[PDB]
Write a protein that binds this ligand. Structure first.
Ligand code: 784
Ligand code: NA
Lengths: 49, 222
């Protein structure tokens, strides 16, 4: 239910009650439990800018 | 790539190129990590010997091709290459993300479009591109695709592209990336697999469905 509406406000992975967000390898879940923060200069899936 | 546009510098950094002994490209790949490249199993039959170019040239240590690959249907068209020397990430050289399977099925595969890229032919009966190109391809309804196709479409394949509009991947792009953008992050969703010609009317591009192989990929990268 909840992940099917704007992805539960998660930046990346959403699972369900309540919403639980997670992130790909090389990212850390932000304090807000929604956003995904890179750990290095070349995280996966980002264009190089 | 027929149609689409050239990638800006840094816009398509996960692209790899498989090159023969004379430094001529014949297939694409996707950077997954410093040591691993995703490509199509059918690309393993295109040259006697090959290496991988990013952006630097890297030799292959191990070829891990799917045990169920069939040349007749292109079912299970997936391989992973482990490189002898690690890739240095830098401008134009960075990996695409591997999604979680459940989320990828429910959320990525249900986006309207993905992005295919490569150095392959710019017309079915034309020449390869010197510059890297990209193309946004709509996901295509499975029933629509089965209706269009002279050959079997399995659960390990999906279709993307256009019915009549003259844009598609082509010879020399195969093995290359199909990625899906989700809030500015690009996830691996496909491998350029096959098509009946390139950009033909009433025909789509056919892609290896990566969601079917996420466990297999994790196992192969250990
Ligand atoms: C599935 N069956 C066996 C019926 C058709 C395979 C034909 N052909 C190839 O052999 C590969 C692949 C392809 O479709 C491939 C290819 C991949 C994608 C497209 C496209 N999207 N238009 C076209 C050709 N060719 C380029 C380099 C090798 C060949
Ligand atoms: Na078409």
């Amino acid at each position: 239910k909840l992940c099917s509406l704007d992805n539960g406000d998660c930046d990346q992975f959403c699972h369900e009650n309540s919403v639980v967000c997670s992130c790909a390898r090389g990212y850390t879940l932000a304090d807000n439990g929604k956003a995904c923060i890179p750990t290095g200069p070349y995280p996966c899936g980002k264009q190089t800018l | 790539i027929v149609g689409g546009q050239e990638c800006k510098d840094g816009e398509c950094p996960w692209q790899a190129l498989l090159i023969n002994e004379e430094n001529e490209g014949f297939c694409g790949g996707t950077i997954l990590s410093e040591f691993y490249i995703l490509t199509a199993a059918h690309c393993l039959y295109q040259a006697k010997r090959f290496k991988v170019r990013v952006g630097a040239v890297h030799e292959v240590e191990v070829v891990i091709k799917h045990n169920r690959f069939t040349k007749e249907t292109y079912d299970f068209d997936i391989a992973v290459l482990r490189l002898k020397t690690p890739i240095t990430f830098r401008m134009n050289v960075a990996p695409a993300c591997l999604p979680e399977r459940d989320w990828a099925e429910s959320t990525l595969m249900t986006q309207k479009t993905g992005i295919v890229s490569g150095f392959g032919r710019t017309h079915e009966k034309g020449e390869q591109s010197t510059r890297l190109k990209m193309l946004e391809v709509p996901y295509v309804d499975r029933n629509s695709c089965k209706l269009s196709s002279s050959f079997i479409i399995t659960q390990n394949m999906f279709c993307a592209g256009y019915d009549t509009k003259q844009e598609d991947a082509c010879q020399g792009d195969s093995g290359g990336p199909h990625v899906t953008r989700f809030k500015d992050t690009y996830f691996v969703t496909g491998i350029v697999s096959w098509g009946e010609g390139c950009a033909r009317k009433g025909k789509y591009g056919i892609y290896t469905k990566v969601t079917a192989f996420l466990k297999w990929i994790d196992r192969s990268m250990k």
